[PDB]
């Protein structure tokens, strides 16, 4: 069976395979080309991917996500301490190692973060296998450039327990560059900036490629800035609107909020191609159907400060790598949030009209690159 490339993301994962000189990003059962990094446990089953995310609103304590934030980390870790204050599922301490605790089939169980990630990895494997019609064994999995030895180990382990022979763990920025062929030798040093604005993390990496050898000169970003924050701005906006028209605050009702957030995320996606989108939610609060809409203009202004602040980490990355705007040769967009028109305008204006590399869907770029690398490695 061919070796596959797997992008194990914080919010979404994606799998691609290199066949006949072309890379194919494989779609799941629901036809999506990316699958949520979600796992859910119920009375009767274990849900993974779309099925898991599609039921979070009613099973918050038993629906796990953000496992990538825990992987390879300790319970005492300040990061873990801060983060766990925001998850509806519980994190327990098992001899210094953090574990997620859920109720599966009425019984209480706990999993190490690598076990949860292995579940998502298993889903990608069977998605590839379904498509290929053959067993998938070898794989190249990607990881952020900033992951340390423990995090890389844990990611590798998540793979082995998923029945995957991890050929190699390569950095996400490097994978993105390989997708565009920016790794080909042109007899000269090339500086490339990877702008990765995903579902929950933002990362800016500056790579220097010489003779086909990558060198991460600098990196910057924010581990808590992503498409989720954009959705939230919309949510808070609609909560206020609902209160105006119906004099009813729905903030307390967790289900109404979660359903609204789902509708916002979807509208947001439409806003990247259309200038307006409608939100049609039946019986949002009590028996009130919430029918409304948003314009791209309004969306842009709701997140103006967030979008704009995106340039700060870019300036920082530049100065650390000791380069001027003019010195970077290529700029590649990675992450689902980069499909947002305002973000593309903003970055391009910053780089004085420089063209952006974005022919490959940004949320598929890393998987795409990993597949090519998997191919050569086999």
Ligand X SMILES: Nc1ncnc2c1ncn2[C@@H]1O[C@H](COP(=O)(O)OP(=O)(O)O)[C@@H](O)[C@H]1O
Within residues 193-252, the interface with Mg ion by CB under 5 A covers 198
Within residues 8-27, the interface with Mg ion by CB under 5 A covers 9
Integer CA distances (angstroms), 143 to 18, 64, 148, 170, 356, in order: 19, 20, 10, 6, 23
Under the binding rule (CB under 6 A), the answer on residue 142 touching ligand X is no
Within residues 247-266, the interface with ligand X by CB under 6 A covers 265
CA distance 193 to 219: 9
In angstroms, what is the minimal distance from the CB of 205 to ligand X? 14
Under the binding rule (CB under 6 A), the answer on residue 246 touching ligand X is no
Under the binding rule (CB under 6 A), the answer on residue 10 touching ligand X is yes
Q: Which among Mg ion, ligand X, none contacts residue 369 (Cβ within 5 to 8 A by kind)?
A: none
Under the binding rule (CB under 6 A), the answer on residue 2 touching ligand X is no
Choose, by CB under 6 A, the member of 5, 12, 118, 119 that binds ligand X: 12
Choose, by CB under 6 A, the member of 2, 16, 198, 221 that binds ligand X: 198
Q: Which among ligand X, Mg ion, none contacts residue 11 (Cβ within 5 to 8 A by kind)?
A: ligand X
Choose, by CB under 6 A, the member of 69, 259, 261, 268 that binds ligand X: 268
Choose, by CB under 6 A, the member of 335, 360, 368, 375 that binds ligand X: 335
Q: Which stretch binds ligand X (CB under 6 A): 9-17, 39-47, 79-87, 314-322?
A: 9-17
Buried b (16+ CB within 10 A) or exposed e, 32-53: ebbbbbbbbbbeeeebbbbbbb
Is residue 204 a contact partner of residue 317, using CB atoms and an 8 Å limit?
yes
Under the binding rule (CB under 5 A), the answer on residue 362 touching Mg ion is no
The response to whether 199 counts as a known ligand-binding position is: yes
* Ordered DSSP codes for 18-44: EETTEEEE---TTS-SSEE--EEE-SS
First to last CA, the chain: 11
When the beta carbons of 42 and 117 are compared against ligand X, the nearer one is 117
Is residue 193 a contact partner of residue 354, using CB atoms and an 8 Å limit?
no
Distant-in-sequence contacts of 31-36, Cβ < 8 A, 24+ apart: 33/361, 33/363, 33/364, 34/9, 34/336, 34/363, 34/364, 35/120, 35/123, 35/124, 35/127, 36/11, 36/12, 36/65
When the beta carbons of 127 and 321 are compared against ligand X, the nearer one is 127
Breaks (C-N over 2.5 A) in the chain follow: none
Choose, by CB under 6 A, the member of 53, 217, 296, 339 that binds ligand X: 339
Choose, by CB under 6 A, the member of 173, 227, 313, 369 that binds ligand X: 227
Choose, by CB under 6 A, the member of 170, 314, 340, 374 that binds ligand X: 340
Q: Which among ligand X, Mg ion, none contacts residue 337 (Cβ within 5 to 8 A by kind)?
A: ligand X
165-171 vs 138-143, strand pairing mode: parallel
When the beta carbons of 9 and 159 are compared against ligand X, the nearer one is 9
Compute the Cα dihedral for 286, 39, 232, 32 and give only its sign: negative
Q: How many CA atoms lie within 13 A of 354 on its CB side?
A: 17
In angstroms, what is the minimal distance from the CB of 120 to ligand X? 11
CA distance 336 to 338: 6
In angstroms, what is the minimal distance from the CB of 368 to ligand X? 12
CA distance 192 to 187: 15
Angle formed at CA 260 by CA 15 and CA 38, multiple of 5 degrees: 30
Choose, by CB under 6 A, the member of 16, 144, 173, 199 that binds ligand X: 199
- Which residues contact Mg ion by CB under 5 A? 9, 198
Binding residue numbers for ATP: 9-12, 68, 199-201, 265-272, 336-339
- Which residues contact ligand X by CB under 6 A? 9-12, 34, 198-199, 226-228, 265, 268-269, 272, 335-337, 339-340, 363
Binding residue numbers for ADP: 11-12, 199, 265, 268, 272, 336
């Amino acid at each position: 069976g061919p070796a596959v490339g797997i992008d194990l993301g914080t919010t979404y994962s994606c799998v691609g395979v290199f066949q006949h000189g072309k890379v194919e990003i494989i779609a799941n059962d629901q036809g999506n080309r990316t699958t949520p990094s979600y796992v859910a446990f119920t009375d009767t089953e274990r849900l993974i991917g779309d099925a898991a995310k599609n039921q979070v609103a009613m099973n918050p304590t038993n629906t796990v996500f953000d496992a990538k934030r825990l992987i390879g980390r300790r319970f005492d870790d300040a990061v873990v301490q801060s983060d766990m204050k925001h998850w509806p599922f519980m994190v327990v301490n098992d001899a210094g190692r953090p574990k997620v605790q859920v109720e599966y089939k009425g019984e209480t169980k706990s999993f190490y973060p690598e076990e949860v990630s292995s579940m998502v990895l298993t889903k990608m494997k069977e998605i590839a296998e379904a498509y290929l019609g053959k067993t998938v064994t070898n794989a190249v999995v990607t990881v952020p450039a900033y992951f340390n030895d423990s995090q890389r180990q844990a990611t590798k382990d998540a793979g082995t327990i998923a029945g995957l022979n991890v050929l190699r763990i390569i950095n996400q920025p490097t994978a993105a560059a390989i997708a565009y062929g920016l790794d080909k030798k042109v007899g000269a040093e090339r500086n490339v900036l990877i702008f990765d604005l995903g579902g929950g993390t933002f990362d800016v990496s500056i790579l220097t490629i010489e003779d086909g050898i990558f060198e991460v000169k600098s990196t910057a970003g924010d581990t808590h800035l992503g498409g989720e924050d954009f959705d939230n701005r919309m949510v808070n906006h609609f909560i206020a609107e609902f209160k105006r028209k119906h004099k009813k605050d729905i903030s307390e009702n967790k289900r109404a909020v979660r359903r609204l957030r789902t509708a916002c995320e979807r509208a947001k996606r439409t806003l990247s191609s259309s200038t307006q989108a409608s939100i049609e939610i039946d019986s949002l609060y009590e028996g009130i159907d919430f029918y409304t809409s948003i314009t791209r203009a309004r969306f842009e202004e709701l997140n103006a400060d967030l979008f704009r602040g995106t340039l700060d980490p870019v300036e920082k990355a530049l100065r650390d790598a000791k380069l001027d705007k003019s010195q970077i040769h290529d700029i590649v967009l990675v992450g689902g949030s980069t499909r947002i028109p305002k973000i593309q305008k903003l970055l391009q204006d910053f780089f004085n009209g420089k063209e952006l590399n974005k022919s490959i869907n940004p949320d598929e770029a890393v998987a795409y690159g990993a597949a090519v690398q998997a191919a050569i490695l086999s």
